């Protein structure tokens, strides 16, 4: 484990063909296949603006952090067994660390 930080614009071009198909991260961004992500960092799992999660995502209530959300992205299915996050998981750490650097820099 060594968060060798990436580039917020590599994380952007990654996000744009990994997560944008289901999620939003600008604060005007409507919820869709999943919630918005703008303000997840420092929240618990399951707290977007009036949006209904799963029983498993709620009973998880993970404090979304730099390290803690990187764990979840490695295998979201195992981390929240029953999650609506149909995705699969970002196997490669380097490619995660870029996306983290973006999503963080889209929250502050
Ligand atoms: C559509 C098939 C999805 C893709 C592609 C990605 N995500 Fe996802 N995510 C999805 C859902 C429907 C949910 C809610 C799960 C539930 O069962 O209620 C989520 C949740 C997240 C969260 C947590 C939000 C919160 O707890 O408030 C994060 C931080 C998140 N997702 C990040 C994320 C990233 C960065 C993705 C690209 C690698 C990505 N998701 C793809 C659905 C889908």
Swiss-Prot record:
GO terms for biological process: mitochondrial electron transport, cytochrome c to oxygen; mitochondrial electron transport, ubiquinol to cytochrome c. One of its GO terms (cellular component) is mitochondrial intermembrane space. One of its GO terms (molecular function) is electron transfer activity. Binds 1 heme c group covalently per subunit. Pfam families: Cytochrom_C. InterPro entries: Cyt_c-like_dom, Cyt_c-like_dom_sf, Cyt_c_1A/1B. Methylation may enhance its transport into mitochondria. Methylation occurs in fungi, plants, and some protozoa, but not in animals. The precise role of methylation at Lys-78 is unknown, but it seems to preclude pro-apoptotic activity, possibly by lowering affinity for APAF1. SUPFAM superfamilies: Cytochrome c (SSF46626). Gene3D superfamilies: Cytochrome c-like domain (1.10.760.10). Its cofactor is heme c. Induction: By oxygen at the level of transcription. Expression drops rapidly when the oxygen concentration falls below 0.5 uM O(2). The keyword Cytoplasm does not apply. The modification N6,N6,N6-trimethyllysine is found at residues 77-78. Keywords: Electron transport, Heme, Iron, Metal-binding, Methylation, Mitochondrion, Respiratory chain, Transport. It comes from the Eukaryota. PANTHER family: CYTOCHROME C. Belongs to the cytochrome c family. Present with 7330 molecules/cell in log phase SD medium. Electron carrier protein. The oxidized form of the cytochrome c heme group can accept an electron from the heme group of the cytochrome c1 subunit of ubiquinol-cytochrome c oxidoreductase. Cytochrome c then transfers this electron to the dinuclear copper A center (CU(A)) of the COX2 subunit of cytochrome oxidase, the final protein carrier in the mitochondrial electron-transport chain. Isoform 1 (CYC1) is the predominant cytochrome c during aerobic/normoxic growth. This is Cytochrome c isoform 1. The gene is CYC1.
């Amino acid at each position: 484990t060594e968060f060798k930080a990436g580039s917020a614009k590599k994380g952007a071009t990654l996000f744009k063909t990994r997560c944008l198909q289901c999620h939003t991260v600008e604060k005007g961004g409507p919820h869709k296949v999943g919630p918005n992500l703008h303000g997840i960092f420092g929240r618990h799992s399951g707290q977007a603006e009036g949006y209904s999660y799963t029983d498993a995502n709620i009973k998880k209530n993970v404090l979304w952090d730099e390290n803690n959300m990187s764990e979840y992205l490695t295998n979201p299915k195992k981390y929240i067994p029953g999650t609506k996050m149909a995705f699969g998981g970002l196997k490669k750490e380097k490619d995660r660390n870029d996306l983290i650097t973006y999503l963080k820099k889209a929250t502050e």
